[PDB]
Amino acid sequence: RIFDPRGQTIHQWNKIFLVACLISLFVDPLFFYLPIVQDEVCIDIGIAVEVFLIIIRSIADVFYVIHIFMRFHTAYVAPSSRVFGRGELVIDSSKIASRYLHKGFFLDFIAALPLPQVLIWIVIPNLGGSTIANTKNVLRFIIIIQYLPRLFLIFPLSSQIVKATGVVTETAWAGAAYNLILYMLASHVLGACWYLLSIERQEACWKSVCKLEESSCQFDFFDCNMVKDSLRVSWFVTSNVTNLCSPNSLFYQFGIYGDAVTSKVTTSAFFNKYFFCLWWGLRNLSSLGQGLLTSTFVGEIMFAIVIATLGLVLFALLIGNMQTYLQSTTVRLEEWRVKRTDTEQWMHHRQLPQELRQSVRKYDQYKWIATRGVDEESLLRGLPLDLRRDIKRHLCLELVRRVPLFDAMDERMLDAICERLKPALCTENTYLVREGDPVNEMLFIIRGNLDSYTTDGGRTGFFNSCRIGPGDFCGEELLTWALDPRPTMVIPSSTRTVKAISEVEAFALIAEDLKFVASQ
Amino acid sequence: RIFDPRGQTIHQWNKIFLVACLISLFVDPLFFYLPIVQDEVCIDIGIAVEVFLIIIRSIADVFYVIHIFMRFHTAYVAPSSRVFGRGELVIDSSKIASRYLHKGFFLDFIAALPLPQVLIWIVIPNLGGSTIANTKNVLRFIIIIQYLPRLFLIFPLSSQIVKATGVVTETAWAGAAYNLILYMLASHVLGACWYLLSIERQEACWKSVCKLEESSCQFDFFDCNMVKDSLRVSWFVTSNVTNLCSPNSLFYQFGIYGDAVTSKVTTSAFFNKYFFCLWWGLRNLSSLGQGLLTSTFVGEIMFAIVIATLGLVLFALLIGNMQTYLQSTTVRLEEWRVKRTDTEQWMHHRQLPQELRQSVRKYDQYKWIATRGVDEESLLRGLPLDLRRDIKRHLCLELVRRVPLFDAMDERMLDAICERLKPALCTENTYLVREGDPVNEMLFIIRGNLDSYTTDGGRTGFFNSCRIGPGDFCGEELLTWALDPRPTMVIPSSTRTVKAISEVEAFALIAEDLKFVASQ
Amino acid sequence: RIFDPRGQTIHQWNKIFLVACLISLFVDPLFFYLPIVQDEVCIDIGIAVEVFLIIIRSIADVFYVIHIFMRFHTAYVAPSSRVFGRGELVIDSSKIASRYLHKGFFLDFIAALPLPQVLIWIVIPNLGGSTIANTKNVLRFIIIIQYLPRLFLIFPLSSQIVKATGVVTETAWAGAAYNLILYMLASHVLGACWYLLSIERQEACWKSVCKLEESSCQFDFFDCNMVKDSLRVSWFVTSNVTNLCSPNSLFYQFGIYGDAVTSKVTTSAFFNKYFFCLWWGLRNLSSLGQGLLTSTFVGEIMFAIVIATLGLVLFALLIGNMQTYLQSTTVRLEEWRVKRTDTEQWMHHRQLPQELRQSVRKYDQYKWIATRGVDEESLLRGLPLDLRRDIKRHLCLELVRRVPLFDAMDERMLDAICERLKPALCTENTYLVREGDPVNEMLFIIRGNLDSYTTDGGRTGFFNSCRIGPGDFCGEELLTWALDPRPTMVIPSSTRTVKAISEVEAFALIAEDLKFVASQ
């Protein structure tokens, strides 16, 4: 029943468990929005939203338990060096169990037990008190103490997911969306923390007001289960806490939660306040923490400093990721620009003539348009013998079948010619091979129209001008070289004037290549 | 009549159609500025501006349908593998029409039909009612559902344009300006959306006020077509909606649209309010959304989140584009600085004497000034044989003509020597070739002056100090070695002390190269 | 008298002209701070500040006209290709004058004539009116129309200065400080523009309030030359202009200029208001335009958009410059980290033993510490023959003079050997070559201690352990092989167990290189 580390079952399980962990990290901070402040100056907790969040977190936690179960029945590749083979997987249950308990089980278990699920639904009635609402506001430390192990373990899991899937994306879409996903998650967490802290500070303000009016107030009057008491309503109508605990008054510094209290975010429905808190987190994380006009209290200042540093790190990482995206997108255009700048500066230093200057840049433009960087030969030797030989045969089969000698011959030397064949490029009105010049390039025309004429060695009259097009033959003198049994070295004078009249791409090949092939 | 995809006609038509699509993307958001709030608290539609925008968008839609007509009669490169040639263009109308129907027609047609031009001019008068102004405020969903396909297809078409015209710019101007154009377009769209949403929220505030005063008010009573009614005057005199619906009052939470009513942007002329909305978009997109002190409403919060995320993406893209511009404009200086610091650190690690340091770090500086990087050999081999030989013969024609050997002899060996010469430099006060040193490179002086003397083998007296300068010849010993018929391998020693009086740029050639030339 | 374009005189003249242009750019916008709003609601200009600024601008324009003179008496390089030489300077005054008038005269002369020095000092006193103070606020267009040519031609001058001095800095200090200098210049220009526009807005408010009080006011009271008039003081007493034209009131929209009146910048001394406006420009360039709560005015909105775009561009340039600075200062550590990560992954994939992985890792750290990147042979072959041989002789003179064969022998083979030496590294406790292994390298010890012993061919007892240290000799077997007159191809076996006890630097010598040298 032990699953192989690289089995597809483990891969799909890790994928769906990454999805489940993202759901867990999105849902856990939502427990901070449970408290609701009503108009009667009371703190109540929505039962329906609490039940929904408890159910969702129970599903997430049972998924975590299933992950623990699966990881407790998986094999690990033993660090055996050996010489050959890779099957160092351990099928013994005791060995894999000891390996997992030595490292991995503690952090994966401290973040999997449903302690938040129980201490809200089974412990609060059992807790030493009869007030559910009050003892659920400051003691929500379990969420933030179990969130850290989950947020820590989410990174290595994503590392294995992106490692075991080949390339993450096409150019950088995954690399840019991952940081935005983490960024939205950080915004959500900060918004939930901000709402909880605003509720805490508003409760502190209410406690301060009760201390100011201790004659007819006691600390538990702000519990919303006691709002119906006659003493509660009498104190509420007599007291003026609904005005004192407001940012407009100077009684108590609300700091950055004055924005929460003024906007009445603590009294609205769940969706409205959730979206407001998420936007607040996004805004104060994106603006680098500016606008957090905090007060002289250590907790709120620490929260603001954490927000500012997290915003710095996340914004800088986003800028870096988008820079990497752009570099991956262009990369080739940048090198082409560098080459064009170099070939425009060098020809300026040497003071080339204008009539010849407009030719090198035209050839460079032709090369970029018809090839788009991509060094043919460097990428060509990278492929194996099978793939390289097959692709060279497929690309140039009818081209080599036009040669009278190569047509009726075995594939032994044919594939030798195909493998060693090289690309060729030529711009418009290029006198490719004038009559007389040595012919040491064997060109096969793959695209374009050519013109080649023989003026009887230099005499006007009988012309050999042929409208050579794609898939034609040229340089027959090198074929005469290949056909000559004697290993001579005297270069043949060109008998024709090969000129590139049109938009032409060719396939040049070295004369010594024919010499070596014929020598075999 | 079918147009070739690579023809100039399609290329120029795509240029003018990109211009038309940019006009469409700039004009379509302007429809949101039609509603105008008068001083008597009524929503009116600018008739002249509406007519102008209908005319402009009708012209844009005519251009769009002409584009559909043109692309309906276009040719494609068929996926025929073949071996040679590129004439895969299909002339048949049935096949091109069928494949265009399969992909391309739906997306380019849903963003081409003139729905905004009909549902404002021919539908509202025929709508089930008589309130033209009232039923033109909230139902502007057609603009935002038809704008998305246009902005989606502007990217592939712009990519085609920039791919069909070679390099986009000189260094990075096109790359840097495209992002800013998109940035202004996003700011304009956000400003138009902000104005429309501000009108929406102010209408909602008016509806809330009317609900508070339902005794003598109606929901359709706010339609500005009924401003002259006696009931209108009576209610407006009695009611206090002028002050109640304002950010100063606390009746209704305006939030981020409060700046519109405070600055009275919903009342001014078209140009003032258009510029205010555009600036609002640009400012709240440039500052990543800070200052959007939202209200506890889901739609406005979602709009603010969209603004923040779009601002983050656009700002990161701009940073990346500018960094790419900086890397492209310098590039060559970067590895020059790298080489300078490497040769400074290496010269310190090996503890070279101070006198010799001033020579190496001056030679490097002179090379940087004279060539500015640019690997002459590597850049030169990329050019074809014809271009290479032409460049070499133009650079060195009279230089090689001064030699007593190569002057009166055939251009074949002149071509051979010229195509294979290499550049060479020397710094100030260089003992280039002292007497007795081997003559391995013979040099052609093209820029600078030399100073070589022969002191009778080391005896004071008769001096051969000649003011040898540009366009001269040096290293005759290698010339004599090449002139020797017997293929000897003895390297002649220099008979003179070749010394560079000043900075000199020269052309080098290895002795074995000249031996190979003389062999043929 | 015609000066060489590359001469030292022109270089120093262009340096001091760059200084003068920067002074002009920092001084000319100061003319916007001339208007001062007094306490009695009037506009006046300080005479002393105007005199000081006009004197400084006169000095700057004198320098500009001297630059016109100098560039009208300079030589230009004729675009003659030629074959040899670079003496293409044209001494003909008529030709250089005609070339200058064709291009460069207009754009430099439009920024040289002293229009601000005449239309303030001779024109306004002779203008059709007596209000010298009033006619110096609206006509401040000459400054902004002449500034653009200066800010345009400053860039080519800076490019020439930075291209006429080799490298600009060590790594990127100049490339990062230039951006800050430009950024301060932009902040200064925008601050001056903001002050002038604030004065214009306040004057527009004054015109509006005089329109409201047309009965007892006309438009000329706000010129301060009439402050002592009875009508002026009576109107000031009766009118409420003191508090009406304030951003606190809602009479007239001050927009972003509310900060100007609230902070009372337009009534303080020169230094205070200048620093406040400069900080305003700096902050609203750095804050990307946030805080510019504009009004519904076209000019203000366009100004805010210009500020936002300038801030975006300048911030992007600064980010790019700093990234370039960091990549230039690190660069070498980058590929070292890449290589270390790559080799760690390579040993991880091949499953190397933990005892041999540490040795390769220690060798990598040794190489990084000893060389810090820097491809020794690649950097060495780039130098010319004179420098390379001198460097080799200095690095290894007695090292090759310690072997008896080369010491009392000619320097020919000495230099031949020294040219072909390559450095060799061996980490702590490196067992270098066994007893009996073929001798392939002839290494010379330059720094470190060795430990080599012979156990009588493998028998315990007589030991040849010697404390070989710096400046010692090894690899005698290759020397004996080279000493043999017969060109045999057998590699002698090592008769010692050479081992590097400590940190050792070596100079490996190729065996076939030694054979080639001895063959000469």
Residue numbers in the entry:
A (entry chain A), B (entry chain B), C (entry chain C): 58 to 577
Extract from the study:
MtCaM has been reported to negatively regulate the activity of MtCNGC15b, but how MtCaM binding affects the CPD of MtCNGC15b remains to be elucidated. However, the MtCaM was not stably co-purified with MtCNGC15b. We then fused the MtCaM to the C-terminus of MtCNGC15b through a short linker. The fused complex exhibited good solution behavior and dispersed evenly on cryo-EM samples. Although the cryo-EM densities of MtCaM itself were invisible, we can observe the density of the MtCNGC15b CPD. Consistent with the previous findings on the inhibitory effect on channel activity, MtCNGC15b exhibits closed inner gate. Instead of accommodating cGMP, the side chain of Arg553 in MtCNGC15b occupies the hypothetical pocket. MtCaM binding significantly stabilizes the cytosolic domain of MtCNGC15b, as evidenced by a lower RMSD and confirmed by the structural observation. Upon MtCaM binding, the local environment around Glu533 changes compared to its state without MtCaM. Based on the structural observation and electrophysiological analysis, MtCaM may close the channel through stabilizing the CPD of MtCNGC15b and modulating the local conformation of residues near the arginine.
